[PDB]
Every structure is written in C-alpha cells, then in structure tokens.
C-alpha cells in the first residue's frame, strides 16, 4: 500500500507563509512525479505544479508565480509545498497525489490539508443537545441531535457514542456566520432503545484541542 | 488555458441504468507523440478524489470496470454501463497536454429514486443554550426525495426570514436521499417574548407543508 499522509489543518494569518507535506511511502520516492492540487470550498480543482524526487525536477502553474513553491526531503520521502503571502483566497484543502506514470494520471491521493487564511481567534464550539419531549416524536425511530455552535475554524469532527453509531447519523455542512461557524448532526435510532441505551455526541475541534461529549437526555 | 466544458449536472439516472458524462476540450489533446491527455476522475462528498480513467479510454488501477470512457481527441465520454447508489458525486475531466494543466467545472451524477417525504423533527433551545442568552430552534427535514424543499419558519404564526441557518445534505451514497437542516437563532429576550415556534417544509410529496411545531410554555 501506497500511502500519501498530508500534514494537519493550519489556521495562519494572512501575509504569513505555510509550509504543508505530503509523506508518500509504499514505492520508490524518487520514482515518481507527486503533484499538488488547490479546492476552495464548493469549487472545482485548480492544479499547483508537479514535482519529481529524483531530479530534483518541477513543473509549475504560473498562476501561482511567486506565491507557490514544491521541495521534497529524499531522506524523509517527504514532499513540502510552500505558501507564500497568504490571503483568503488561498484558504483551500490542498491535496497532494501521486502520478502512476508515464502520463497515467494521480492514481493515489492524499488525504488533504484544509488551510484557512484568516485574522480571526480560534474559538472552541459550543454543542448544545437535542432532545424530543415537547411534542411526542414519531412512532417507530427516535430523532435527537448536537447543535455545534460559535467556533472557528473548520474543521470539526462530529461522531456519536464515539463512532459506534454510525447508522442514521447525518452531519451537515458548517455554515459560517458572524466569523463563526455553526453545524449540526442528528441521529435517528429505535423507540425503544432511548434513553435506556445512551446517546452520546462527540464533537472534535483540534484547532482549539477541544472536544466536548454532549449525553443527549430526555 | 485550455479550457474543459463539462455540464454541472446530469440528468437523474435510474438506479441500474446507463450513463454518460461528456466533456469538450478548447484544444485537441492528442499530441504528436501519440498521447492523449485526457483522465477522469471522481471525487465522493468529503473525500479526496479517485482516478477512474487516463489517457481518454484507458481504466485506472482501482476502477471498477462499470466505467469506460472514449472520445475523439476533442470531445469525450465517460460511461457507466449500471449506476450504483454509491456513484454518487462529482466527476472530473482534466488535461495534462499544456501548461497549465486544468479540470473541467464537473459534473454531478444523481441517482433517481421513488419519492420520499422529509421526515421533520423540531427541537426547542437547550438550557444551555439559554443561560447564554442565546436561542436557536432547530428543524432537521431528513431523508427525501427529490432535493427541491423550502422551509418556512413562523413565530406566533408569523413568517420570520431573519436568523435562519441552512444547511444539506450531497445525496446519500447509500439510499439516495437528502437532508437539510434548518436552525431560527434568536436571543433568549425574543424567544422568551412569543409562544409557537413553527418549521413548515414545501415539497412534491405533500399539497400542504409538513409542520412541526412546539409551544415555549
Ligand atoms: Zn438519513
Ligand atoms: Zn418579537
């Protein structure tokens, strides 16, 4: 198994420079061309430039002139793109791939590394329960919820009774407001099976290295 | 540049059924080397993309062979031979044959499934909420088809646009679906001054709205 691991989510300040990698392992590092490619949030694919470990060798958009540049560690089989000049427009997930050869295309990807560009304080989310009892819910399945208020940046991560309830579970799209962000998760079970069986919200904001669980009660 | 025309949508497609997405090139991309340099490739709602054909016709390592693509150097097809639910997504031409390289916008696959109603639940503010002098009533609308909803929020029976917060779902991956929520936030002041709190749904599956409803005292 190829594995391209992208370096974590960074929140800078705009006219700073980031400097995010890509450590590819699974094949020879230096065989490969490894590429780097820009999504803004509700976008399409811009391509950043290209780089191959054994030369070393580059090719690069120029849209990105001066503000991109794509190094690699042969030591580490490490590849690093550097980001220069930061504005909000470069908030992005960046993604790096690996191109499987003579013109074959990214045929393995990395996970993404979201930067968000901004002046704005991290702020820890506040998560509020949601639970029935003013109006007697449905008949068969219960629906409850986490609402997941006031914090910045993206991203958060949102699982209940830690990941062991995955069924049933849909987790909306943050929306930002106000320089904060707000989200919001329900989980729809059996009748019968709350509360006696406990649920449970876990949300995760590692750019305040807070999570917080939320019991959701009646 | 060189400049991918791709469609942003597709028709819905029948659960099972054939595919196609094409894509337009502003340049021919074969070269005079014999290459052409044209791939596909699909990115799922929340995941990094998957490269599903190189070279226009050539299928990927990791592709399932439901895909296919072809073209005349110019213009291309990607074909799906049976759709799954789990297709679902944004699929993407590229080209490598000129600096700089570029995508297409993409286009987004859906899955046409029956009809289904939302399944409309409301949440009154959390104490906690409250004690921060904050109220936000929530309405999460989950599970429908097809994806055109509105939602409309009344206090003491009265439309209010302000402090309204929406959000959906892509298409489940699994059953075809949407959902939206809906949070009204308003300071605990104002919720504390009005009585009925009302989320009502507009959709094809209902003459009259879905409303869920609850009563502060
Ligand atoms: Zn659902
Ligand atoms: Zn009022």
Known sequence: ?218 | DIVLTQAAFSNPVTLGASASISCRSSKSLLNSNGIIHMYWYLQKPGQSPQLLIYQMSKLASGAPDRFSGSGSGTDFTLRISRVEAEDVGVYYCAQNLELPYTFGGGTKLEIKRADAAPTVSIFPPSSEQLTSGGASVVCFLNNFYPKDINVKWKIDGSERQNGVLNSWTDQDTKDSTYSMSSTLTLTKDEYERHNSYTCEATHKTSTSPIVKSFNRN
Request: net charge neutral.
């Open chain 1, 1 to 218: 198994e190829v594995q391209l691991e992208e370096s974590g989510p960074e929140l800078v300040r705009p006219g700073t420079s980031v400097k995010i990698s890509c450590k590819a392992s699974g094949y020879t590092f230096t065989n490969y061309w490894l590429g780097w490619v820009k999504q803004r949030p509700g976008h399409g694919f811009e391509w950043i430039g290209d780089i191959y470990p054994g030369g070393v060798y580059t090719t690069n958009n120029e849209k990105f002139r001066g503000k991109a540049i794509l190094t690699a560690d042969t030591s580490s089989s490490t590849a690093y793109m550097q980001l220069s000049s930061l504005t909000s427009e470069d908030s992005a997930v960046y993604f790096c791939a690996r191109a499987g050869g003579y013109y074959t295309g990214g045929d393995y990807w990395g996970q993404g590394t979201s930067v968000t560009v901004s002046s704005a304080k991290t702020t820890p989310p506040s998560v509020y329960p949601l639970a029935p009892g003013s109006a007697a819910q449905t008949n068969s399945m219960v629906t409850l919820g986490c609402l997941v208020k006031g914090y910045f940046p993206e991203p958060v991560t949102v699982t209940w009774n830690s990941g062991s309830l995955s069924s049933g579970v849909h987790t909306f799209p943050a929306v930002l407001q106000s320089d904060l962000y707000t989200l919001s998760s329900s989980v729809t079970v059996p009748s019968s099976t709350w509360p006696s069986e406990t649920v449970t919200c876990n949300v995760a904001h590692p750019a305040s290295s807070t999570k917080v669980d939320k019991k959701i009660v009646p």
